[PDB]
Amino acid sequence: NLWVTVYYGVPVWKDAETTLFCASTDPNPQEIHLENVTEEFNMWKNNMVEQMHEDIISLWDQSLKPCVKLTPLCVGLQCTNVTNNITDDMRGELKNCSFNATTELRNKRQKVYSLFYRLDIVPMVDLWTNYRLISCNTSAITQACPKVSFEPIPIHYCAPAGFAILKCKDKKFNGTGPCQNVSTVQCTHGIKPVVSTQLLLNGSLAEEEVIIRSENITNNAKNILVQLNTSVQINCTRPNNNTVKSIRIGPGQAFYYTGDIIGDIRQAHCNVSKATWNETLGKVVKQLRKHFGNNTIIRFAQSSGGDLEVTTHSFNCGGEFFYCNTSGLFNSTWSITLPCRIKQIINMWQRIGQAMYAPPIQGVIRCVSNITGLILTRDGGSTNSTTETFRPGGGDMRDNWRSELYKYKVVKIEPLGVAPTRCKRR
Amino acid sequence: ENLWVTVYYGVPVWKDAETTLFCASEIHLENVTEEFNMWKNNMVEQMHEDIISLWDQSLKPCVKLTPLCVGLQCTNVTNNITDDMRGELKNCSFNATTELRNKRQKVYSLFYRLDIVPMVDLWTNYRLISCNTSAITQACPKVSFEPIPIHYCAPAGFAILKCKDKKFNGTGPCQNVSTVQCTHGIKPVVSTQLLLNGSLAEEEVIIRSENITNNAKNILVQLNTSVQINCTRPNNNTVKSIRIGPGQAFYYTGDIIGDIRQAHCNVSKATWNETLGKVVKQLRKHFGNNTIIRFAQSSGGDLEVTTHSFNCGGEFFYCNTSGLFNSTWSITLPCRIKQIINMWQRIGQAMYAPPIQGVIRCVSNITGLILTRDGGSTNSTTETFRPGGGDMRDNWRSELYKYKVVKIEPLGVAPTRCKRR
Amino acid sequence: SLGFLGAAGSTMGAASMTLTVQARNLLGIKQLQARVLAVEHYLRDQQLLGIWGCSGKLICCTNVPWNSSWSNRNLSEIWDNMTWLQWDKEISNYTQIIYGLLEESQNQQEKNEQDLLALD
Amino acid sequence: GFLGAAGSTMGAASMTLTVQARNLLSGIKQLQARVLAVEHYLRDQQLLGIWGCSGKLICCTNVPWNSSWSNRNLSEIWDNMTWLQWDKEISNYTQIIYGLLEESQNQQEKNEQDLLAL
Amino acid sequence: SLGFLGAAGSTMGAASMTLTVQARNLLSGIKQLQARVLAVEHYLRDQQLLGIWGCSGKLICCTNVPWNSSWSNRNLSEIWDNMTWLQWDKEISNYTQIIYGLLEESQNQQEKNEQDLLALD
Ligand SMILES: *[C@@H]1O[C@H](CO)[C@@H](O[C@@H]2O[C@H](CO)[C@@H](O[C@@H]3O[C@H](CO)[C@@H](O)[C@H](O)[C@@H]3O)[C@H](O)[C@H]2NC(C)=O)[C@H](O)[C@H]1NC(C)=O
Ligand SMILES: *[C@@H]1O[C@H](CO)[C@@H](O[C@@H]2O[C@H](CO)[C@@H](O)[C@H](O)[C@H]2NC(C)=O)[C@H](O)[C@H]1NC(C)=O
Ligand SMILES: *[C@@H]1O[C@H](CO)[C@@H](O[C@@H]2O[C@H](CO)[C@@H](O)[C@H](O)[C@H]2NC(C)=O)[C@H](O)[C@H]1NC(C)=O
Ligand SMILES: *[C@@H]1O[C@H](CO)[C@@H](O[C@@H]2O[C@H](CO)[C@@H](O)[C@H](O)[C@H]2NC(C)=O)[C@H](O)[C@H]1NC(C)=O
Ligand SMILES: *[C@@H]1O[C@H](CO)[C@@H](O)[C@H](O)[C@H]1NC(C)=O
Ligand SMILES: *[C@@H]1O[C@H](CO)[C@@H](O)[C@H](O)[C@H]1NC(C)=O
Ligand SMILES: *[C@@H]1O[C@H](CO)[C@@H](O)[C@H](O)[C@H]1NC(C)=O
Ligand SMILES: *[C@@H]1O[C@H](CO)[C@@H](O)[C@H](O)[C@H]1NC(C)=O
Ligand SMILES: *[C@@H]1O[C@H](CO)[C@@H](O)[C@H](O)[C@H]1NC(C)=O
Ligand SMILES: *[C@@H]1O[C@H](CO)[C@@H](O)[C@H](O)[C@H]1NC(C)=O
Ligand SMILES: *[C@@H]1O[C@H](CO)[C@@H](O)[C@H](O)[C@H]1NC(C)=O
Ligand SMILES: *[C@@H]1O[C@H](CO)[C@@H](O)[C@H](O)[C@H]1NC(C)=O
Ligand SMILES: *[C@@H]1O[C@H](CO)[C@@H](O)[C@H](O)[C@H]1NC(C)=O
Ligand SMILES: *[C@@H]1O[C@H](CO)[C@@H](O)[C@H](O)[C@H]1NC(C)=O
Ligand SMILES: *[C@@H]1O[C@H](CO)[C@@H](O)[C@H](O)[C@H]1NC(C)=O
Ligand SMILES: *[C@@H]1O[C@H](CO)[C@@H](O)[C@H](O)[C@H]1NC(C)=O
Ligand SMILES: *[C@@H]1O[C@H](CO)[C@@H](O)[C@H](O)[C@H]1NC(C)=O
Ligand SMILES: *[C@@H]1O[C@H](CO)[C@@H](O)[C@H](O)[C@H]1NC(C)=O
Ligand SMILES: *[C@@H]1O[C@H](CO)[C@@H](O)[C@H](O)[C@H]1NC(C)=O
Ligand SMILES: *[C@@H]1O[C@H](CO)[C@@H](O)[C@H](O)[C@H]1NC(C)=O
Ligand SMILES: *[C@@H]1O[C@H](CO)[C@@H](O)[C@H](O)[C@H]1NC(C)=O
Ligand SMILES: *[C@@H]1O[C@H](CO)[C@@H](O)[C@H](O)[C@H]1NC(C)=O
Ligand SMILES: *[C@@H]1O[C@H](CO)[C@@H](O)[C@H](O)[C@H]1NC(C)=O
Ligand SMILES: *[C@@H]1O[C@H](CO)[C@@H](O)[C@H](O)[C@H]1NC(C)=O
Ligand SMILES: *[C@@H]1O[C@H](CO)[C@@H](O)[C@H](O)[C@H]1NC(C)=O
Ligand SMILES: *[C@@H]1O[C@H](CO)[C@@H](O)[C@H](O)[C@H]1NC(C)=O
Ligand SMILES: *[C@@H]1O[C@H](CO)[C@@H](O)[C@H](O)[C@H]1NC(C)=O
Ligand SMILES: *[C@@H]1O[C@H](CO)[C@@H](O)[C@H](O)[C@H]1NC(C)=O
Ligand SMILES: *[C@@H]1O[C@H](CO)[C@@H](O)[C@H](O)[C@H]1NC(C)=O
Ligand SMILES: *[C@@H]1O[C@H](CO)[C@@H](O)[C@H](O)[C@H]1NC(C)=O
Ligand SMILES: *[C@@H]1O[C@H](CO)[C@@H](O)[C@H](O)[C@H]1NC(C)=O
Ligand SMILES: *[C@@H]1O[C@H](CO)[C@@H](O)[C@H](O)[C@H]1NC(C)=O
Ligand SMILES: *[C@@H]1O[C@H](CO)[C@@H](O)[C@H](O)[C@H]1NC(C)=O
Ligand SMILES: *[C@@H]1O[C@H](CO)[C@@H](O)[C@H](O)[C@H]1NC(C)=O
Ligand SMILES: *[C@@H]1O[C@H](CO)[C@@H](O)[C@H](O)[C@H]1NC(C)=O
Ligand SMILES: *[C@@H]1O[C@H](CO)[C@@H](O)[C@H](O)[C@H]1NC(C)=O
Ligand SMILES: *[C@@H]1O[C@H](CO)[C@@H](O)[C@H](O)[C@H]1NC(C)=O
Ligand SMILES: *[C@@H]1O[C@H](CO)[C@@H](O)[C@H](O)[C@H]1NC(C)=O
Ligand SMILES: *[C@@H]1O[C@H](CO)[C@@H](O)[C@H](O)[C@H]1NC(C)=O
Ligand SMILES: *[C@@H]1O[C@H](CO)[C@@H](O)[C@H](O)[C@H]1NC(C)=O
């Protein structure tokens, strides 16, 4: 009675992993809401996070190729103390280091004197030198081009023809499971590739409430990503009127360094309010209690030691990589100012062999910045769920980008299908 | 009239389009009028970008002269120097590097004054020019820069329309239009004041300019006859080379055998005078029969834009051009030689042209000019033109002006009486 | 008027009215790989329709009868009470048998038409 | 020859559709050019396919001609116009015509689906 | 059943029943993309050439071009039962362009005749 009828253009899809376009090529966005659908999402199996990670690494590596190498500056340094007025907390933090640098001429050196942060130098004992640059015994140092900025620029990931991106609009979406309010887009919204290690800055806020996302909430080896519904503002500054000088080290190689600091030296601090931070932590704890016992005491603590790039909270305020100390922020059991250390020679992500030198920017650097999320890690159930301790632990950078790509899934369109009809060909 | 839409595929229509053309190395269209605009032709922009990219890719895998940015002790040349060549050449000495890293060497060499700059020192006198701005790379002595005809070809689905009209001024409708897939062989000849080894007009000198009333734009003059230019550097240069590193080689002028004379380029007086007569006859069509036309010297810039650059055999001849123009309506024109050149109009890069052995003598066909109008608002009817410089696109726009890239739109609709059942 | 995949959650007998909306939306190294793979997927689907004798059609009726072992449902529940996604899931790993039957049926049809057109 | 009929009248140019065809299909820039030509060819073939005109160069349809698109008679259209002038004249309605063509095919297959269901 | 080219050494009649098996195998870092683009271009040129002849969508296409005895004077029994496609293709070398031109012209005339027949009220 019934016959096979072939249809082409069937609105069905399968989960798939394909290559996405990076648009910024400004797209004309479209969004089609899908009525009466349910789609299973899994933010921790989303290939878009791995592809975004690879794209950011490739763009970063490409940006540093046509730039000045600092190979001739891997020389011994004669470092002494800074003669300006400093406080007790900054004793030994900044050093005045002299060295012999090359010039455009191959057989004519030049004495130089430059201020360096203590974190950027390592002791090395010789008759006339005291320190060397931290990375010169591990890898070449490449100077970032001063014409190229670091500041995140929102980008869009776009599926190729034959593929589509599904967006989950459900409130209180925990990152996995079914989603009912699902729409189809060709390109994602503008996602800022913001680089941070403990707090998520300039990201997306939750529509309804604080959302706690974990691949396995009972596995203490996985990170917990907390998205806030309200932002908490961070005011960061390096209160030092830095005077930047430069020297020519090769035929086309110009090197930039700290020349001097005008006036007294004061430390580099980020201010977060106390009323809103206390409300934020109360909300986070209230949401945590829904994944643990209702009478379990939840306490926050300082991060563990080891690997300064992880133990501190990074930004890219101005053009200078801060590294703040959240120990005074999470020291509570359920304003505020954070001493931030400055480095210039940065090994970003967890790579070894590619060292980038961030040149200083003249003047003061002050930036205000929305905190939109947190990365928390649990210490472990050593008390049998009597008391739980959470720390602002670090993790791979994928966790920050996943915190934006959790709403998107890539699906492959399958235009063909078959179905019974009474239609017989002849 | 009971008409129905009929869909036709293979419709002979097109749209103006900008697409990517590829390099390589003719169907007449009757009753077709096509509007051309040589100053909106994206083939010139693509040719410019392609030549820049090809040049940079050819220069990249070559010997760098970074170790040669050292101080030099330069003295006067001890050969017989004529009155015009005094101070143009220096006998410089510079210690250099060697295949090994623990040794050095001494390298006497003969440099042009344009290639070195005075420095502030007590022991050395000069530096190589641009060592304080960019790295200098030597252009591999195998590869050549000799112009080779390049054909620009459209992708499938696109076509190139060629205007065959006589007295075509670069814009407006063309009546004689042909379709090609690839252009003819266009030589990427590099020059500034005069256009060499190009095509000729069939009937008369053609004056092509954008908004000719605006004197800020350049005027491209295409001749219908050629003017033979005979350039030479009468000097038997003996070239030596040094290792300066494993697998590296630097070439320099060792000495000059015989007397030293300047680079003289000869231009026939009568042919050039007739050419300028033709140019003023055509300019008067745009300025008035009673307008006096003066051809003055180029000014307002450095050696790169105020002289006639002209690769010949390898060495770049910056000819003064004072013996041309210089009039109100054999010429042994002096020329300067420069070795550390910066082609295009960039800054971040520099190229060293290795000297070529023996006497250099070329014979080139002047097929066009680039002129600039002095301007002013006096209503004096005494317009003055100079052989001003410009972007390199104006040389490549002196060709590729009759070609337009169009996208084929084979799909179309039309009414017919045909109804599908 | 619903847009691309707008009918994806609608019933099969309603979503079948929007096949042209889906069809029109099917068309540096990474960008070329994405464009070439989209072209290859389109061409494989078009060749597969051509093998079945359905070239140039979006709704193509065939001569393969429906087996009750593939889906023991009536037309009302298939077309009016379920979506194409649920149908596609229901007949997963039965489509290769259907495709083979369609290929063989078209080969037999082409031979029969050639023999009919060979009669004087 | 290719585009030789571009200056001919449409009645004469419509007989050279196979001459205009075949010229649509035949280091990274050359590969991008090839992919672009293939993409445009496939977009045009899909656009014909969704109209029920697949495999044909002259395809008759069931969409009546609207006098608001062009009020010329067939003698003037086919004997006194080239395809370029015609394309310029009706460009502002081309997409509207395409939409109507698509709609006709959407109905046509459904009717055929019903006729074969008897 | 016989595989991709299993019928290559079989007779033309037997090999004509395996067209879909070979048709499926025509479609399925810079040099890999060049290879893929070349495969796509060859497929599309063949599909276009069939479309010009009015054979689009069919693997066996009957036409209106009579066979010329100057191309091959073998009878159907010898061509289809005692000859392979490779030997036949060798036999009709230097004649395929004439056949292709005749097929193109015949389809153009067929399209004009169909358009005129459909223009009768
Ligand atoms: C999060 O977003 C905020 C808001 O965009 C970022 O702060 C803003 O950053 C821009 C770009 O650096 C600042 O513009 C700069 O201003 C200085 C002023 O001297 C100027 O010299 C630079 O050339 C540039 O124009 C802008 O001032 C700043 N605005 C505010 C209100 O903070 C912030 O950097 C982002 N945070 C992260 C971690 O990406
Ligand atoms: C860093 O050290 C340099 C010397 O290496 C200091 O430069 C000297 O500063 C004194 C200040 O009284 C001057 O009198 C000298 O003439 C300077 N010498 C040179 C060579 O510049 C520099 O001031 C030090 N900077 C800081 C911040 O302590
Ligand atoms: C920078 O260069 C100066 C050049 O004078 C170095 O000073 C001399 O160093 C040698 C050993 O390299 C000593 O024997 C001399 O006595 C030094 N001269 C003076 C006046 O102190 C200086 O040590 C170099 N600095 C660094 C950090 O390498
Ligand atoms: C690189 O060196 C050249 C040569 O000295 C500089 O160019 C000269 O700059 C002076 C500046 O006082 C001018 O007066 C001269 O006319 C220039 N001469 C030439 C031949 O160019 C150039 O400015 C230097 N560039 C840098 C970045 O230091
Ligand atoms: C710098 O001063 C601090 C105390 O002000 C002292 O502890 C430190 O050792 C000094 N460093 C040097 C290099 O003199
Ligand atoms: C480079 O020096 C640091 C100084 O502590 C040391 O930890 C590191 O291991 C050194 N690198 C290598 C490759 O040994
Ligand atoms: C998200 O919520 C759904 C609701 O049923 C639950 O099944 C799922 O396990 C949750 N996932 C996580 C990661 O909390
Ligand atoms: C889905 O989310 C959007 C977000 O604004 C909302 O407007 C829409 O009503 C939601 N859909 C449903 C079915 O609730
Ligand atoms: C954020 O969530 C808290 C949860 O108590 C709620 O009180 C507050 O109003 C929410 N804010 C917004 C802007 O949704
Ligand atoms: C993962 O989650 C399940 C859910 O109950 C839990 O039983 C399991 O222990 C978790 N994995 C680990 C490694 O703890
Ligand atoms: C500092 O922080 C508060 C709260 O985070 C914010 O409202 C205020 O605008 C900031 N002020 C400055 C000067 O950065
Ligand atoms: C941070 O707080 C300190 C405390 O006094 C203040 O001096 C500084 O100005 C604050 N920073 C900003 C950016 O407002
Ligand atoms: C942050 O400050 C606390 C204050 O006790 C200190 O113990 C901790 O080590 C600091 N963080 C880092 C990364 O040094
Ligand atoms: C730093 O001091 C200099 C003194 O000349 C002044 O011109 C400059 O504006 C100051 N910069 C800042 C950021 O205070
Ligand atoms: C930060 O939060 C405030 C709160 O309203 C918002 O208006 C502002 O635009 C946010 N800034 C950024 C950079 O996201
Ligand atoms: C070299 O020639 C220049 C030309 O002016 C002259 O000034 C200079 O004195 C001459 N030097 C010697 C050593 O002859
Ligand atoms: C070029 O010739 C056309 C002929 O129609 C004319 O309209 C146009 O103004 C001319 N332009 C120049 C710059 O001579
Ligand atoms: C077009 O130019 C060509 C160039 O040789 C010439 O042969 C032909 O006669 C010209 N046709 C017209 C119509 O001017
Ligand atoms: C070139 O054009 C001029 C117009 O002034 C004419 O007199 C001359 O004879 C032409 N030459 C040729 C070879 O046609
Ligand atoms: C041409 O130049 C004149 C100079 O006054 C100016 O007024 C006019 O707008 C210009 N036209 C164009 C098209 O550039
Ligand atoms: C140069 O012109 C002469 C006659 O003017 C001609 O014979 C010769 O072929 C031309 N050469 C080139 C390269 O244009
Ligand atoms: C330069 O001087 C050296 C000194 O020995 C001499 O050998 C060489 O020939 C001289 N070169 C010129 C060009 O005068
Ligand atoms: C150029 O003309 C001069 C006239 O004195 C002559 O001596 C010289 O040899 C000529 N050179 C060439 C290359 O024609
Ligand atoms: C240029 O040189 C050639 C060489 O044969 C000669 O025939 C011609 O007359 C010369 N022309 C001039 C203007 O010197
Ligand atoms: C100049 O005189 C000639 C003589 O015939 C004439 O044809 C031309 O139009 C005149 N031009 C002007 C600008 O007066
Ligand atoms: C060209 O020669 C004249 C002769 O007086 C001279 O004034 C002019 O400066 C020369 N050109 C250049 C670019 O030096
Ligand atoms: C240029 O013209 C002036 C005008 O009198 C003349 O004196 C001078 O000699 C001329 N120079 C050249 C190089 O033609
Ligand atoms: C230059 O002089 C050398 C001396 O041996 C000779 O061999 C060579 O041929 C000369 N060059 C020319 C171009 O005559
Ligand atoms: C969703 O289901 C309801 C239930 O009747 C139906 O009315 C509605 O049309 C469905 N949505 C779509 C897009 O068809
Ligand atoms: C298909 O139908 C036949 C009878 O028509 C039956 O024997 C066969 O088992 C069915 N297919 C499957 C996969 O069961
Ligand atoms: C189709 O089968 C279902 C299964 O129970 C039944 O409920 C429904 O009434 C049937 N419909 C028809 C039209 O037979
Ligand atoms: C075939 O598809 C059905 C559809 O649900 C599924 O249940 C069955 O497991 C599939 N067969 C195999 C072998 O997986
Ligand atoms: C161009 O128009 C003339 C007018 O008589 C006509 O004879 C000729 O055939 C037309 N050209 C073409 C290619 O049809
Ligand atoms: C023809 O077009 C007009 C508007 O362009 C429209 O109102 C009219 O309905 C169309 N004709 C038909 C028969 O629908
Ligand atoms: C077509 O319309 C034009 C209007 O200009 C008219 O002259 C011509 O005779 C008409 N043709 C027919 C066949 O009615
Ligand atoms: C098409 O529309 C544009 C503006 O919308 C108008 O300028 C043009 O003349 C129109 N074309 C026709 C053929 O009427
Ligand atoms: C090969 O030839 C033999 C001849 O006896 C035939 O039987 C056999 O079928 C042929 N092979 C194939 C694959 O058809
Ligand atoms: C076969 O080809 C010959 C070649 O001239 C031709 O004369 C003959 O008419 C052709 N046969 C048929 C039936 O057309
Ligand atoms: C076909 O031709 C061959 C060779 O002339 C002959 O042996 C055979 O019998 C012929 N067959 C038929 C059916 O005519
Ligand atoms: C085709 O032409 C070539 C040219 O020499 C010839 O060798 C070959 O035999 C011809 N083909 C046939 C089937 O005769």
From TrEMBL, chain C:
Per the UniProt entry, the disulfide pairs are 54-60
Task: Outline the segment boundaries, as ranges, of region: Fusion peptide.
Answer: 1-14
Instruction: Give me the glycosylation sites of this protein.
Output: 67, 74, 81, 93
- Ranges for the region named Immunosuppression are 30-48
Q: Where in the cell is it found?
A: Virion membrane; Host cell membrane; Host endosome membrane
Coiled-coil zones: 89-120
Q: Which segments cross the bilayer?
A: 1-17
Question: What does the record say about its membrane topology?
Answer: Single-pass type I membrane protein
- State what protein this is by name: Transmembrane protein gp41
Give the species: Human immunodeficiency virus type 1
From TrEMBL, chain E:
Q: Which residues form a coiled coil?
A: 90-121
Topological relation to the membrane, as annotated: Single-pass type I membrane protein
Localization annotation: Virion membrane; Host cell membrane; Host endosome membrane
Q: TM segments?
A: 1-17
Location of region: Fusion peptide: 1-14
> Got any disulfides in this one, which pairs?
55-61
Q: What is this protein called?
A: Transmembrane protein gp41
Q: What is the lineage of its organism?
A: Viruses, Riboviria, Pararnavirae, Artverviricota, Revtraviricetes
Protein encoded by which gene? env
Which residues of the intact protein are shown? 516 to 661 of 860
